[PDB]
């Protein structure tokens with residue numbers, strides 16, 4: 001079909017969002033990641049002991065191995081995954097591509113194994129950063145975009161509730177008002193953009209913020225200057241060394257945080273900033289430092305209050321308030 005949509009649901013505390021997709025003859029839940037250009041899956045090649053409890057892909061009659069191709073992805077916490085590659089049919093809510101490069105996991109870390117609801121990743125960043133070697137592969141969106149009514153996909157992640165991913169069109173029932181666009185910087189392979197300004201509570205700043213829209217990241221990661229400024233507004237807040245971030249009394253009042261895009265305000269309700277309970281009557285904040293990254297990451301904490309349009313023409317990023 002020229003258009004299609006899929007339901008996406010969050011795991012506990014909105015840590016990640018999983019979306020069902022069909023790969024070959026199998027159906028499994030993958031993490032749609034606009035910060036990655038790889039589509040990898042738990043498979044029949046993954047050790048039985050490592051895929052226990054997971055839905056997985058078994059390369060069948062429609063699979064065509066890309067002989068000699070390998071892939072490997074490493075994460076901050078140390079988690080990793082790697083394996084080989086096959087081309088096969090991938091279908092996302094009616095939109096499919098018959099020969100999508102599917103990266104089969106031959107090994108994954110204990111963290112991945114323990115996260116039984118997560119059976120892989122479906123990268124939505126630019127193909128320029130796909131990790132397959134010796135020759136990188138095209139992402140799903142890159143393969144199907146010309147066949148869509150419009151070369152775009154949109155995301156409306158939600159807090160503790162079902163959300164959606166739209167391909168080839170925007171769904172007017174998911175947002176209010178009109179969509180406001182801003183130019184995208186894909187030089188690093190990400191959906192990079194620059195917010196014109198921001199505001200902590202009712203205190204606005206005329207300074208811009210440059211970063212990327214990443215559905216695969218849990219929190220809203222900003223510059224220390226801004227993170228420190230935000231928690232200065234939260235009574236009892238403090239940096240918890242053992243938690244690796246700012247925490248505060250679970251009952252503390254949290255101000256909203258918004259960023260300005262053109263004439264539109266993308267507001268993160270203070271409610272979403274109270275991320276997770278860490279015991280002792282303390283809560284871990286949804287806003288944390290982007291230290292080490294070099295730039296800001298507009299992750300799920302931020303995205304789940306917005307309807308975001310990823311437009312390949314430009315490219316550009318659009319924002320609108322969720323209905």
Ligand SMILES: *[C@H]1O[C@H](CO)[C@@H](O)[C@H](O)[C@@H]1O
Nearest residue numbers: 001002003004005168169
């Ligand atoms: C994708 O979405 C378009 C626009 O709503 C539909 O016309 C099509 O049938 C498919 O559901």
